[PDB]
């Protein structure tokens, strides 16, 4: 198949869309900045969506 977010002639997200897949992508758009994408095991340094990428970046306080 082709994923519903993909323009397969360009190999980019279709016109009007942001992203294809990933923990911080939902329905071809980025999740809002600050959305929690993984809760920490010990204590309170969670990982959060950036608003501008589809990955879930590691908390910078570590």
């Amino acid at each position: 198949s082709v994923n519903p977010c993909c323009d397969p002639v360009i190999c980019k997200p279709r016109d009007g869309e942001h992203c294809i897949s990933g923990p911080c992508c939902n329905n071809c758009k980025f999740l809002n900045s600050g959305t929690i994408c993984q809760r920490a095991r010990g204590d309170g340094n969670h990982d959060y969506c950036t608003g501008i990428t589809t990955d879930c970046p590691r908390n910078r306080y570590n």
């Binding site: 994923n3 993909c6 002639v9 360009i10 190999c11």
Partner: protein, 63 residues
Amino acid sequence: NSVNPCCDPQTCKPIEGKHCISGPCCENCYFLRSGTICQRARGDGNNDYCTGITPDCPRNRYN
């Protein structure tokens, strides 16, 4: 047209093992070697070169 020969439409990324889809510094789905000349300048000796890590033609950083 068809799906681009370099594209995996299931992922919307290059097929596994390939580098890139299109661009002046992509050929056959791979990055051209860094230093390949991608645009010769008019007036001077400042030409633009492929990076070996991206598929675009970067503006020479001296200008």
